[PDB]
């Protein structure tokens, strides 16, 4: 798909068998989702956003489907205004910016 | 051009007569630039994201050259950690996400 930016680039994702909405975010290094249960161990990570830094939980090698495209990679869980798909998974689904 | 997302999608912009580096950010509704002077009227605004909210000045009808392409729109100025080109100007240069 070709996604224009006149509205927010919201897509459906599937993680742990559940459908969620998430924003495709080229300004995000990493993928972060709202509080939910993920399998396995987690590690700490600090992330910087527009209003400051926050601590989050980093879960590696998580299966996630994004707009029907399969990915397996790192997902952060923490306080975010919206679920965000960042570059670590956008690269896996082959996304590019074009102008 | 076609920009991959292996690294942060940084481009050179010209705004207010000044050259700056900025991030092409599809997650951002708005364009946000580090503290600088711009001509004309402004009004205060709060914008938020991970880590909370920051107060900015909202300038309307500002012309910005983005990687060689001219666009006009609202620009927010304030203590952002990175200059951000958001969707309000990405649309004007014809930027799309493709996968």
């Amino acid at each position: 798909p070709q996604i224009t930016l006149w509205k927010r680039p919201l897509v459906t994702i599937k993680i742990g068998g559940q459908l969620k909405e998430a924003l495709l975010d080229t300004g995000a290094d990493d993928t972060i989702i709202e509080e939910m249960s993920l399998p396995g161990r987690w590690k700490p990570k600090m992330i910087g956003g527009i209003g400051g830094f926050i601590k989050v939980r980093q879960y590696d090698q998580i299966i996630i489907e994004i707009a029907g495209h399969k990915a397996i990679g790192t997902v952060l869980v923490g306080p975010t205004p919206v679920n965000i798909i960042g570059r670590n998974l956008l690269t896996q689904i082959g996304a590019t910016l074009n102008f | 051009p076609q920009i991959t997302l292996w690294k942060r999608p940084l481009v050179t912009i010209k705004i207010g007569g000044q050259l700056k580096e900025a991030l092409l950010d599809t997650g951002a509704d708005d364009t946000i630039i580090e503290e600088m002077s711009l001509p004309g009227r402004w009004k205060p605004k709060m914008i938020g994201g991970i880590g909370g909210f920051i107060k900015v000045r909202q300038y309307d009808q500002i012309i910005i050259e983005i990687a060689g392409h001219k666009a006009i729109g609202t620009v927010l100025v304030g203590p952002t950690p990175v200059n951000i080109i958001g969707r309000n100007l990405l649309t004007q240069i014809g930027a799309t996400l493709n996968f």
Partner: peptide, 5 residues
Amino acid sequence: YDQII
């Protein structure tokens, strides 16, 4: 630190 905006 990584940045998310």
